Design a protein around this ligand. Structure first.
Ligand SMILES: OC[C@H]1O[C@@H](O[C@H]2[C@H](O)[C@@H](O)[C@H](O[C@H]3[C@H](O)[C@@H](O)[C@H](O[C@H]4[C@H](O)[C@@H](O)[C@H](O)O[C@@H]4CO)O[C@@H]3CO)O[C@@H]2CO)[C@H](O)[C@@H](O)[C@@H]1O
Ligand SMILES: OC[C@H]1O[C@@H](O[C@H]2[C@H](O)[C@@H](O)[C@H](O[C@H]3[C@H](O)[C@@H](O)[C@H](O[C@H]4[C@H](O)[C@@H](O)[C@H](O)O[C@@H]4CO)O[C@@H]3CO)O[C@@H]2CO)[C@H](O)[C@@H](O)[C@@H]1O
Ligand SMILES: [Br-]
Ligand SMILES: [Ca+2]
Ligand SMILES: [Ca+2]
Ligand SMILES: [Ca+2]
Ligand SMILES: [Ca+2]
Ligand SMILES: [Cl-]
Ligand SMILES: [Cl-]
Ligand SMILES: [Cl-]
Ligand SMILES: [Cl-]
Ligand SMILES: [Cl-]
Ligand SMILES: [Cl-]
Ligand SMILES: [Cl-]
Lengths: 599, 599
């Protein structure tokens, strides 16, 4: 129906867009550089369109990429995506290992409230704020970390991952409490409690080790799971998700043990998701055929259930059930890819009419802590599955819509697994030469205006800009030059000594020096304006993205020879600020923008 | 009961405090300089605690000082004040002559609304605003200018004043309209109309010339005067004042003609002012004995009536009437000087517990367009009669009370005449060596703080202040020096050319240069911070009284030798802004504040 191989290729690439510093050598994202290098634990993924590392959804997302490989790794070698998926997973699992603090873990980097108040690119956030870390022993977060490491140890054949999976499971199982999990409250609160994480983790530890003691633990947790409403059934009217993986765990146990209780649960849960429902009860469906669990990330929930449904259908023999679940699964993935009332992809950079304004700071590429400028994203967030449409299939591509245009690690995770299943079956050719290079705009440049002209002086207002985005970055040794032709000065009988440079305004906190008038060649001379710590010119807000200086170059009062019209840097200037290529910008001795007299 | 000679001495000096530029060489006020030198007509008096020249009250005030000399000039020779009164009067009359524009006159300098919106000293107002002038031929204003010059011509024996008096009288009489008198609206509108000015001017012209044609004109105007309420009597229930001088004109005509109608009017009018009243009708009196005509300037009105009552009493023979009017007159002057329920003088700088916060911009001496700072006036407005108490004798000395602490030319004018009569009678010794010198504050100085510091730099925040007040003034070629000892630099094998001067903040609009590091003697060097137009540093507002610069002097980054503690200009600096004597200030090459290494 779609090129599922290309979709898979892009959905994996999304994770490279999310990587915190230091980036691996293989990172393919031209607009990403090392970022948040002062974080207490390095690497891992930024969670969503923000810069917080939230370990619960991060570990969940890793666990799901691990599960994708566990089911379909061999079946996707043809797509060419297996190696990409494996090393992207490893990057996250390495972070989880790096969080170990013995009887506790670092479970969050960054404060949600503080992070979210600011809109700008990852690489420059340390100029805006100082990022905290959080330590604890929450059973849900630690349990999920264990699960991700357990499946990761299988698929990546890695004994360190297994050792840490065991460590974290033991901690979580000994703690049996979410009370020390607080930093993510209101963002990723533990809603279901922790017994489902202990189930998920112990199940994966059993699949990793074959040690029946884990299967014993797993089966011991099921009576502690939340019930459906006031009945005795285990809750089934929700999705497998970052908060609650008992759904997937029961499917794994159905296949691993063959026991009827797990098959019963799997069928009741999946029937509730399908259009036929479960004895008169069913998830809400949009008229366009999307199973729509909640306002937040309906595509995430539906595509995750697609993966579970594929796995369960592949694991049973009953042809009616297999077809019902397979059809459900493929219908949800296909909706996401364009089988909907608008015939449009909800995967950024893929298919017909994809979203172009995902709620994502670093892909947007602002310089002034606004969402509306630039009006178009500077970068392509390939592969990101957006939140998706409302309950009635309605949708508008709007950066302000942090619900419908949300993107996140957990949104892509189950989706990757389902795309693995579909490319396994239908093939498809991934894109060669992916990703293609982006059109860039000017990043470092001066905007200048004639602040005042006089028969004896020129006064310039000059803003040295850092609107960098490929990647956003900091340059310390910034300077620019203003070139003049002094022929008229010498013809009048005057000298360079008779020309005075003064300052009429210099922006607070921008340490600046202006050189003496310096000879270039012939009658061409210049001044250099140097910012000693140019990293303070940075795309983090209205005040910081440019440093303003007003400088005056003056012959003596009363003289009538001054001619700015033959000065190279005056060319094209008006009374309104405008970018000029004739006041070139330098990083140390290297010219990075503009032109010099005589080329 | 008072030293009326000292009161007179000070009440005259008040006018010197009011003089606009260019000041005469004999001006005795150390805190006044040439001010408003760009005015369309130079000289004359600022009206009140403001800087508007309002010709109607100005000319009224001059006419009253003239009348004082006409009646009592010989009689005050012993007080030593005659020559002071004469030259003060001439300064105003010269302005009135200079207002001539042929078919019209300049009748105002300054926009009342813009003038009053700003709180600051006369000598610096042109940095704040441009002052318009206004031209017209309003009969009241021109008529009063005529009257002032007519009496002035007599008492100063001056043919030029008589010539302009006649010309202005003819202009006022030809025009017979206040329609072209607009700029004073709401401040000094013509309330009574212009017939009384024509009466007053023609009466003075008769007294000046002995030409009975002027007497005939004068008498021709009396049927045109306003009536008392609905009656046939000429209005008598008010005071002789800036708006209406018919009261005094009638007294002059009683003496000049002997005619019963004028005596009848004079006695009706003066009886209404006395405690005994006229036919049961009387001006309001306070319980403390002040005749209280209106909320605005009650002392002004009462002391003016005292002068009229003295003049009329001295012109009649009836001992009963003479004592009634003399007692009234003396009671009102004595109230103003301290014979009141609070035993307090209402004349600034005179007597017991005088007002210390008159509503007067220049005497206050602010630098930041505020009334509350400084909390005490920096100058003594000697001789100013304030508005005075309420109808219940209530009063508080508060700069904000522009009613009770109002001061003005017209408040002092009749008052001087009454003081002349009282000094004539009682003698008194004027103050020797008046005025005494004031305690002065520092006027031009740097406030500095260590803004940032490290092992390779010093960063200073420096505010170059102009809080001048003795007098307030402007200095264009302002600079200050920051002195260092570079011993440790050479000691480390580095040169002057290894020390970098940079700027971290330069206040907008303050064109500034910083010299290279310049040698003084030994290892002592300095940078000079020069303001190209230092007149923009001026005591006109919160933002203008000081220019802020943040400068950094830096050894190379990484180095460890930098030693600010042997730097002369570093001495005593803290992290909080404070005046420092070690960053000396210069006007051109002349030090005007502070100290220099080694003297
Ligand atoms: O009670 C029913 C059911 O609840 C399940 O728990 C739910 C919570 O009820 C629900 O509020 C929570 O919703 C999340 C949503 O899943 C996240 O995707 C969204 O994430 C934000 C993030 O918080 C921001 O930091 C970032 O900028 O944007 C992302 C993407 O929008 O956050 C909201 C609020 O936390 O989801 C829970 C899990 O589905 C229980 O699991 C189940 O047992 C209950 O029956
Ligand atoms: O109807 C009765 C009577 O009126 C007389 O005219 C009066 C006006 O009625 C009265 O409003 C006016 O009040 C003046 C007052 O004399 C001034 O001293 C005051 O001056 C201000 C000045 O305007 C400001 O610029 C400055 O900052 O402060 C000073 C405070 O002194 O201004 C008010 C308003 O103009 O006075 C008139 C004359 O007494 C008629 O003369 C009479 O014929 C009527 O019967
Ligand atoms: Br006119
Ligand atoms: Ca849970
Ligand atoms: Ca030139
Ligand atoms: Ca009048
Ligand atoms: Ca030193
Ligand atoms: Cl179905
Ligand atoms: Cl834009
Ligand atoms: Cl491509
Ligand atoms: Cl070039
Ligand atoms: Cl005082
Ligand atoms: Cl004295
Ligand atoms: Cl000295």
């Amino acid at each position: 129906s779609y090129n599922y191989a290309e979709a898979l290729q892009k959905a994996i690439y999304f994770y490279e867009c999310q990587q915190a510093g230091p980036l691996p050598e293989w990172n393919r994202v031209e607009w990403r550089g090392d970022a948040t290098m002062n974080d207490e634990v390095l690497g891992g993924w930024y969670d969503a369109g923000d810069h917080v590392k939230f370990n619960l959804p991060m570990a969940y997302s890793a666990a799901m990429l691990g599960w994708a490989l566990y089911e379909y790794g061999d079946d996707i070698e043809a797509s060419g995506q297996r190696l990409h998926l494996e090393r992207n997973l490893a990057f996250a699992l390495d972070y989880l290992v790096a969080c170990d603090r013995g009887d506790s873990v670092v479970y969050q980097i960054g404060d949600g409230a503080a992070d979210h108040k600011w809109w700008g690119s990852a690489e420059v956030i340390e100029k805006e704020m100082t990022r905290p870390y959080f330590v604890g022993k929450g059973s849900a977060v630690v349990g999920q970390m264990a699960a991700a490491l357990a499946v990761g140890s299988i698929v990546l054949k890695n004994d360190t991952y297994l050792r840490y999976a065991k460590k974290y499971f033991e901690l979580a199982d000994a703690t049996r409490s979410d009370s020390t999990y607080t930093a993510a409250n209101g963002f990723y609160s533990s809603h279901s409690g922790f017994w489902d994480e202990l189930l998920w983790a112990s199940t994966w530890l059993y699949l990793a080790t074959g040690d029946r003691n884990y299967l014993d633990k797993a089966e011991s947790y099921t009576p502690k799971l939340n019930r459906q409403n006031q009945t005795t059934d285990i809750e089934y009217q929700w999705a497998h998700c970052w908060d609650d993986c008992h759904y997937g765990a029961m499917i794994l146990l159905a296949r691993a043990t063959g026991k009827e209780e797990y098959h019963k649960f799997a069928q009741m849960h999946l029937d509730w998701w399908t259009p036929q429902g479960y004895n008169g009860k069913r998830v809400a469906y949009t008229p366009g055929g999307l199973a729509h669990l909640d306002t937040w990330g309906p595509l995430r929930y539906a595509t995750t259930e697609a993966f579970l449904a594929f796995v369960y259908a592949d694991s049973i023999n009953d042809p009616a059930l297999k077809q019902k679940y397979y059809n459900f699964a493929k219908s949800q993935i296909d909706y996401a890819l364009g089988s909907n009332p608008d015939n449009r992809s909800y995967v950024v950079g893929f298919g017909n009419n994809p979203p172009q304004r995902p709620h994502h700071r670093t892909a947007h590429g602002t310089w002034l802590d606004k969402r509306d400028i630039p009006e178009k994203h500077r970068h392509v967030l390939y592969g990101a599955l957006v939140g998706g449409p409302g309950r009635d299939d309605s949708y508008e591509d709007n950066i302000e819509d942090y619900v419908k245009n949300a993107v996140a690690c957990d949104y892509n995770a189950g989706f990757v697994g389902a795309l693995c299943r579909l490319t396994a079956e239908y093939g498809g050719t991934p894109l060669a030469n992916f990703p293609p290079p982006e059109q860039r705009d000017d990043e470092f440049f001066v905007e200048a205006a004639i602040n005042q002209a006089s028969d004896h002086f020129t006064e310039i207002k000059a803003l040295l800009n850092n609107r960098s985005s490929w990647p956003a970055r900091l340059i310390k040794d910034l300077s620019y030059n203003y070139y003049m032709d002094l022929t008229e000065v010498f013809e009048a009988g005057y000298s360079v000594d008779d020309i005075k440079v003064t300052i009429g305004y210099c922006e607070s906190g921008m340490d600046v020096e202006i050189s003496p008038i310096t000879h270039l060649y012939d009658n061409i001379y210049y001044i250099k304006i140097s910012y000693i710590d140019g990293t303070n010119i940075c795309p983090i807000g209205q005040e910081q993205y440019a440093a303003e200086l007003q400088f005056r170059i003056a012959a003596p009062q009363g003289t009538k020879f001054w001619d700015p019209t033959n000065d190279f840097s005056y060319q094209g200037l008006t009374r309104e600020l405008a970018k000029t290529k004739y006041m070139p910008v330098f990083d140390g001795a290297t010219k990075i923008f503009g032109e010099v007299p005589g080329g």
